[PDB]
Amino acid sequence: MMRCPECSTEGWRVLPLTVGAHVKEGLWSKIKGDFYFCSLESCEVVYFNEQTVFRKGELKTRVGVKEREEPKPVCYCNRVTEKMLLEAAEKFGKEKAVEITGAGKGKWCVVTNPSGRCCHWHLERLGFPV
């Protein structure tokens, strides 16, 4: 609902629980309420709100959609990278790759995933309908 201050993309709400799991611990005192996640590949911003912006360099976690080179995480619960997904998609086809990597099968995404959401959105963005 809130728009990224850098790229204008609508972000999705994330709780302090999620933000604290992904930002460098030295920045925890700056986490004072909800943030919004910027999912745009080109934008340096990862979390933003009225008070504070955390860019890629302020996170301890690599955010898959923001990374140009491997490792490019997609599923954080099951430790699946873009490379694993496309390697397997070439061998077994995109649908059997999702099934074989285990991407999307976890439940702890609000903490493991920087977006605070299940990795389906990124899987779908990559052409792996789930």
Ligand code: FES
């Ligand atoms: S991040 Fe993929 S199932 Fe949680």
Ligand SMILES: [Zn+2]
């Ligand atoms: Zn942005």
